Amino acid sequence: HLPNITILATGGTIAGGGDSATKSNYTVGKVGVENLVNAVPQLKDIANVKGEQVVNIGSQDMNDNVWLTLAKKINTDCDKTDGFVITHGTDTMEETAYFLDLTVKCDKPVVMVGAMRPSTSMSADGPFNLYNAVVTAADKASANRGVLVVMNDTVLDGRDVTMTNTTDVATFKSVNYGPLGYIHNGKIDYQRTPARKHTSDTPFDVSKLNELPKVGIVYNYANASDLPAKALVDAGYDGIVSAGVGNGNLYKSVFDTLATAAKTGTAVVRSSRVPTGATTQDAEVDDAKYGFVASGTLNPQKARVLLQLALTQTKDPQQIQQIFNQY
Template sequence: MKTWRNVLLLLAVLVSVNIVAKPKIRIIATGGTIAGVSASSTSSAYTAGQVGVQTLIDAVPQMLYLADISGEQLVNIGSQDMNDQVWLKLSKRINELLNKEGYDGVVITHGTDTMEETAYFLNLTVKSNKPVILVGSMRSSTAISADGPGNLYAGVAAAASPNTKGRGVLCCMNNRLIYAKDVIKVHTTDVATFEAANAGPVGYVYNGEAHYFTKPEALHTTQSEFDVTNLEKLPQVGIVYGYANCSPLPFQAFVDAKFDGVVLAGVGDGNFYHEVFDVAVKARQKGINVVRSSRCPTGPTCLNGEVDDEKYEFVAALDQNPQKARVLLMLALTKTRDWKQIQEYFKKY
């Protein structure tokens, strides 16, 4: 017992004098509430994307005990303005950092509005088994009890942990770790806004250490067949929201604009209002891929359930919500337009 204590003490000393190298972690800042500023520390009104990456790092000096930290500012926007070009730039940069520049992990500061979509896109396009963690905040940097610094510290702790390797992309918010495939935003303002409604969180960060319960089942990162290395743009895919007495005009607008695909945020098990259904059938006849998802926050959109997908050549989103189904359909369309093959992608990813 005494021998092990001596070993641990020696390791602690070596780390403190940098003889044992700490993990090399790069923080990529994209803006969001974590970089937001408000006129009042008690106001819910703020402007996102005002604080730079070095200011975020300087606010959490405790991170330096966990890793060798450096940062870069990719963009500085509210995540409501996240777009395909930033996704492509971000994915390519992460691949450079992890595969060419020797970094051990990447932490991305991001707005919460579209964090789940960015996380899923990266989960399918990053080509490394090293940790990639997205963090954000629900309170601006100038708010009372701002949650950004704590989330950033926990995200770095997760990225620096050898336990995180090989798990794909994760979100770390409110000390919870959630896989990119499962994470969804469930509350407009609460700091506990992120959940994995169908699967639950997969781990947590406590005392600067990441702990996990499960490993991911779906394919991701190095197992993914999607590659954006040479892509300058992504296929155009829109989402149509379903409701009672739903107008077919939004779906028809995507068809008229010659979009490559349309995702239906359908009612119940991905069902269509009859006028929308007719437009969807015509869209397939024109070669536009149609994915059925659901506006329900939990549960799958079943293949060949109430809708005969085989007959109409629709794709069932299975356990993906509309916004993530859009991400997967865009990437699928970079490989094929065969609806059967696209359905296989939804089964694997």
Template sequence: MLSRLFQRSLFVAVTCSAVFAQAADKLPNVVILATGGTIAGTGATSTTTVGYTAAKVGVDRLIEAVPELKQIANVSGEQTFQIASENMTNENWLTLAKRVNVLLKQSNVDGIVITHGTDTIEETAYFLNLTVKSRKPVVIVGSMRPSTAISADGPINLYNAVAVAGSADSVNRGVLVAMNDEILGARDVTKTNTMLANTFRSPELGDLGYIVSGKPKFYRATTRKHTADTEFDISKLDKLPAVDIAYGSANANTIAIDAFAAAGDEGIVYAGTGDGSLSTPVRARLTELRQKGFFILRSSRVGNGPTVRGGENDDDKTDFVVSDTLSPQKARILLMLALTRTHDTKKIQDMFYTY
């Protein structure tokens, strides 16, 4: 009798294991690359949402904190960096992009999630949008509250990001940001508030969709080229051309511009007032630098709308490039990558209308 019960129990156990194994085989395989940030941060108390320490919690603990992930994907994790995102460097970007490209070539990887600090999440997203060579989903996620806070937003954001990265609907949509139940495109997303959970927006051109009950719902797609369709190859690069941003204002002078030029920058992005307008001394100095071989790009500090070629400056005469609708921080990224391909300003300008 006991033998029969044992055999039946063993049969049930083996059958259940086989069913679970079969179910796991049908789940997408998602790799989480952790880089630090608030999502991995800790505070002194459960009500500390400002003044916490970022980048303290490792990737294994992040995954363990969301056991529901096992229901939607086969998840594995790697600790790529452990930094606050204001410390993200060009070299970090190159390392991250190369690792993403290696992983996405593997047949047993269906998507990538990158945990990241929110301060520069939009820049990393756009860099990857231009340098990832795969149509598989890449989703960047962070949080506005540390892991120790009441109502920490990190766990649900991570769950949603894995759901998006594992979905076939996310294929060939470029690099995505998943925050606050929203799906945003890397090119247009920006941080709009210093502390609120709904800080990430694409103010003019709109979000791409929502995450509803763990499933992505897309309503639109970007028309600009990205990922597998870009011309940028970082596989053999160990550094990027030096490009910095000078900020325009009333009473604008050339002190920052002069410092960047003296430091050896190849390009300067000028975040001008209005439609990228330039004060008289700034225009004169930037024109002089262009004649000396520096690459000058006009952008705007406004945050919305295009910087129009020929609008506030005779860009054909001065041989400047304009950023179109890219923010200064994203224009810097595209200019750096553009300079790895060409020094022809007309071709560079075309890139700003393409990507």
């Protein structure tokens, strides 16, 4: 009769700990899901919570196998529950949020949440962030909006959400298109929803996949080395994402290596190290001439999520561009 709500715990600074409340030092992986739930007894006011510990890692070590395990579990257990919260490291939550946004086939709410302060800190942000994540997953209006991230009283879509600051509790922002809703006193005023296709409206199906296509990221800057790009090509990577300078521009020697790569079986996506705004067509690079794909507003690490999934469907740069214009 209260919403049934599953928490899938993956680790992160929300389950991490230091030897002092008032020193910054901490390590991830100290606290199980039972202990987090128990630190918020007010959850039983809003939901019937069930917690499982899928893994316990720092999200700096998030990987393809944990992504597959999560998407598979959510997809199989969808019918058991009214929604899911995933407790997660903050460092790569914006990656896992987008991978689930594209492969989750459950249109029931799936809410990701972490903490910028360890469980042991003075003014720890984890307990209230977890409360609000359950408020969100239990809100009937949260369904059909794609996979969500809830941080600092804010409901953010999985596609546009990113980290803006290294330490600030208020780091997570949807920096191009804004947030979906604000949470106040356990109620959400939703004024937006992602137009890009997600969840059950995407062709991606990882139900029977045990690995993903290999996709690396190369940085651009003055005097950039080509050695990173060469190393990925030498290893037969399925794709490379460029964190370009400005509007996805390539240092000349990186450009040389990725042009060869795009014409010899490696997919190439131009994104940007710049934190907001689209990597666009119709600027300084004719993507189609090189066989590149322009990432749009997807940053390097998001573009790598969508490129891995595009490559389960096609190697064709025109098709990949069509997928980067729809998802």
